[PDB]
Design a protein around this ligand. Structure first.
Ligand SMILES: [Mg+2]
Ligand SMILES: [Mg+2]
Length: 540
DNA sequence: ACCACGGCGC
DNA sequence: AGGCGCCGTGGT
């Protein structure tokens, strides 16, 4: 019943804190408190009081550690019931949600957050009793990873502001050309960013066929699915798509980046979240690195903005084909495993297995087919979309999917076994036992059920790839710290480091070894490494 | 400002 | 290929 004692707290208290805004690097610490045995201790001066703690334990511990690091304090994050909640069920992604689900309330008062953290931790710890695989993940991956991520977020990355000015101008110049042409074809200016105004132009004024409908507003859609089907019905459609692409790039990944350069540090502090996704993959925000375009040369132009400090270099490491390697491991398909053991081009081999021709006879269009099939099958691409993407009949798409499963029958078996297990147990799991609940496999609606089926056989693969990277980051960090090198960015299956140019080569060698050897699979883990003054130069 | 929403990236 | 972070719009 509310025992309130003075600051400082006994060792092993849980902390609660309130920030002026959600982003710790940019926030003022408004209040700080700790709780132990349900006894709450409120700090009189929060920043001063941070020096009394030896670690941050509690909800959003990593975020307090980032802010402490900004302030020159080494306050590592430790136990956090968010990590436990996320292990129990990855739909647990926010403190508000976790309190709602398991008891208590996420409020705006630091003492209450401290008390909540303590009770939630005990509760969730009990709920994990006997779950040895999740507990292994907590101890070997999640808790130690949180300290790595704190350092990554607090360190940040240098941007090339002169380059971004030049890129901005170039893109602005092309947007203006496209804009003028859309208006010339429409016969009058209008707001190209307004889908409502664009709907009226395309379908009422120009009279084009309206295929699809919006999802909730019930109007004629102007989505790329519609426009693609009309790219010939009128030249304005192609210009709209080009304009949309550039404006999305500019407004998302050019215009906002310089404003994200911190006044104190001179660096951009991408935020990393380890309890955000269905699969266990790390997420980033401000900016979201995952959605920098990867197909287009546009994406490359953004990566070029990320540069090393003067006298340093960036080292970029990528797990080549890790999703397919994991699929090979999980399915045990001996044909797929052989491709990788033999160190062969996986798409050329797939093509040559698929088509029963020698690898020398595989032409680029065949390799493109194999590549699309490889990932189509992984991601649950339909025959209809496959037929669009390769520009072949629908029946030929169907045949090509069946040819793949004939060649890789244990991949077919594994997908069906995985769906059966998910339907039986209500969840699927990764190699390490990270678990995702999949209730909608029972869904009545075809669309919703099929989405659940894709999640069911994607999560084991994606989440194994995720935890391999996360384990590798945990293993690598202490070794980099000792070389005076640092971890900066993680996205997809890639890790970006920064090191003094004198030690960049040795750092690369060390990181490649650690990542390739993180865990033994039925196939080799292969890491592509590059070194450069900017991220584009390092990963090309 | 707040919100839901279309649209789009992965 | 395939839940959500992101942008700008239009409503209040
Ligand atoms: Mg685009
Ligand atoms: Mg929405």
């Amino acid at each position: 019943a509310l025992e309130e004692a003075p600051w400082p707290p006994p060792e092993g208290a849980f902390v609660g804190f309130v920030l002026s805004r959600k982003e710790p690097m940019w926030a003022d610490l408004l209040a700080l408190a700790a709780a132990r045995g349900g006894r709450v201790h409120r700090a009189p001066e929060p920043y001063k009081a941070l020096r009394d703690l030896k670690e941050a334990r509690g909800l959003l511990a990593k975020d307090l550690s980032v802010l402490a690091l900004r302030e020159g304090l080494g306050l590592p994050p430790g136990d956090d019931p968010m990590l436990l909640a996320y292990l129990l069920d990855p739909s647990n992604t926010t403190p508000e949600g976790v309190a709602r689900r398991y008891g208590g309330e996420w409020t705006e008062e630091a003492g209450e957050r401290a008390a909540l953290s303590e009770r939630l931790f005990a509760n969730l710890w009990g709920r994990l009793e006997g779950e040895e695989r999740l507990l292994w993940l907590y101890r070997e991956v999640e808790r130690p990873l949180s300290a790595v991520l704190a350092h990554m977020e607090a360190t940040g990355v240098r941007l090339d502001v002169a380059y971004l000015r030049a890129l901005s101008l170039e893109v602005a110049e092309e947007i203006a050309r496209l804009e003028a042409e859309v208006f010339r074809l429409a016969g009058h200016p209008f707001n190209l960013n307004s889908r409502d105004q664009l709907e009226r132009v395309l379908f009422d004024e120009l009279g084009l066929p309206a295929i699809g409908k919006t999802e909730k507003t019930g109007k004629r859609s102007t989505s790329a699915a519609v426009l693609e089907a009309l790219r010939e019905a009128h030249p304005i459609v192609e210009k709209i798509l080009q304009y949309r692409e550039l404006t999305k790039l500019k407004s998302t990944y050019i215009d906002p980046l310089p404003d994200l350069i911190h006044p104190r540090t001179g660096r951009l502090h991408t935020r990393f979240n380890q309890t955000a996704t269905a699969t266990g993959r790390l997420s980033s925000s401000d900016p979201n690195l995952q959605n920098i375009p990867v197909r287009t040369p546009l994406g490359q132009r953004i990566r070029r903005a990320f540069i090393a400090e003067e006298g340093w270099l960036l080292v970029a490491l990528d797990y080549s084909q890790i999703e397919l390697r994991v699929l090979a491991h999980l399915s045990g398909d001996e044909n797929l495993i052989r491709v990788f053991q033999e160190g062969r081009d996986i798409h050329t081999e797939t093509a040559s297995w698929m088509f029963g021709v020698p690898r020398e006879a595989v032409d680029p269009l065949m390799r493109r087919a194999a590549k699309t099939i490889n990932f189509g099958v992984l991601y649950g691409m339909s025959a209809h979309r496959l037929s669009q993407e390769l520009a072949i009949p629908y029946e030929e798409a169907q045949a090509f999917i069946e040819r793949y499963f004939q060649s890789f029958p244990k991949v077919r078996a594994w997908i069906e076994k995985t769906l059966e297990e998910g339907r039986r147990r209500g969840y699927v799991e990764t190699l390490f036992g990270r678990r995702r609940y999949v209730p909608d496999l029972e869904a009545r609606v075809k669309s919703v059920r099929e989405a659940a089926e894709r999640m069911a056989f994607n999560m084991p693969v994606q989440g194994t790839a995720a935890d391999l990277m996360k384990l590798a980051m945990v293993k690598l960090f202490p070794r980099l710290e000792e070389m005076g090198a640092r971890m900066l960015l993680q996205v997809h299956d890639e890790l970006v480091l920064e090191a003094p140019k004198e030690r960049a080569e040795a750092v690369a060698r060390l990181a490649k070894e650690v990542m390739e050897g993180v865990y033994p699979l039925a196939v080799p883990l292969e890491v592509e490494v590059g070194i450069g003054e900017d991220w584009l130069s390092a990963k090309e």
